[model samples]
Target: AQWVPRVDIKEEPNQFVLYADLPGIDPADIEVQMDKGILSIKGERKTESSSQTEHFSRIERRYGSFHRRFALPDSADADGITASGSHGVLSIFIPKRAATTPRRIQVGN
Candidate 1:
């Protein structure tokens, strides 16, 4: 129920980069969703070994379903958003909306 993954948001000339740490999770199992100006990431982690004979002295790692949401800004291009997962890191690219920012106009006397 609690997600402690580190996230970083960076702004570029035309897009925003989002990086989320999702260690021990498979890239194919990750899911991303955007609804009503909210973005969410959900995923599950599975054990590599099928055998469950290991005695657990301590189980501090949080597993199972996890979800994270963020309120999207008006300048975000909803239709142009793209996401990819590699090396246990999830990367999201959000392009800015066209015409969202006012362009410099010539001063007419």
Candidate 2:
């Protein structure tokens, strides 16, 4: 009932981008969730042409439910995350939290 989708994560200077390959999947079928520094993606692919059809020689394509999760670090901005689906690809943008880097805080004189 579950299938693993291909995904890639790219780290940038100010943010991180995640790309997932979901060919022929509807945008509405996908769901993205973020909580407590964890990102979750879940979706389902329906089987086409349910009408009683002749038996096929081979069924290679995958269909059914799928899920993916990534443990984001504390530096990842939980509130600044966004996701979009385009060209059969799901893109998730995670912005880095500001003021999380090591820096000296000077007291006001």
Candidate 3:
């Protein structure tokens, strides 16, 4: 199964910021992996009624599992990618690659 959490993406000075609202799950438990420019999040969750005495007419709360992924290269830096999750939100930091320019060498006269 697949699940989509609330997300927000923004760009800033040679870097990208990705946010995903990941509540009810421990950040350590979530699997943060990158493959072929695709970032993925995998985790599991369970929900319970806030109050047993007062039951809701309908149950719309999501639980049991979580999944999220997105393409961001945007590379092999491997060491440049970083992420953090807190207050039920996951944030990803991806720094852009530097420009590759070639130069010509001149021989001494």
Candidate 4:
């Protein structure tokens, strides 16, 4: 079975931010992509190998590959997508369009 990283999304006044918990994972193993109003995050965490000298009585913690995708609204600015990783967390910033509110058209007099 594969392991899926935990993710949290938050909406701010000007942008939407995504944070994924990914401690001990290499930055190169992570992949982030946005296409056609879809945001995707994929990565893999390797398992530790067993040694002849050392043996483990119990095993905990998840390791493997994972994939996560999200459907973004039209207000999400895909072109301005930015991502950064720090302190075992991956942060993605999706800016919102200038005018996200619905526009009302005036009727002809």
Best by lDDT: 2
Query: Which whole-number lDDT from 0 to 100 does residue 70 have in model 3?
Result: 80
Q: Rank the candidates by lDDT, best first.
A: 2, 4, 1, 3
Residue-wise lDDT of candidate 2 within 1-109, one digit each (tens)?
3789999999999899999998888888888899777899988987663443356556677778898989997779989998999999999999998874688999997
Q: Write the per-residue lDDT of candidate 3 for residues 48-100, one digit (tens) a residue.
A: 75546267677777766777778776433445889998898888888888777
Tell me the lDDT of model 2 at 20. 95
lDDT of 4 by residue, 21-106 (tens): 98888777788988878999987876673443156566676777889999887888899999999888999999998884688988
Q: Write the per-residue lDDT of candidate 1 for residues 63-88, one digit (tens) a residue.
A: 55577777778888878899998888
Candidate ranking (TM-score, best to worst): 2, 4, 3, 1
Note the residue pairs that clash in candidate 2. none
lDDT of each: 0.78, 0.86, 0.77, 0.85
RMSD of 2: 2.8
Measured against the true structure, the TM-scores of the candidates, in listed sequence, are 0.74, 0.82, 0.75, 0.82
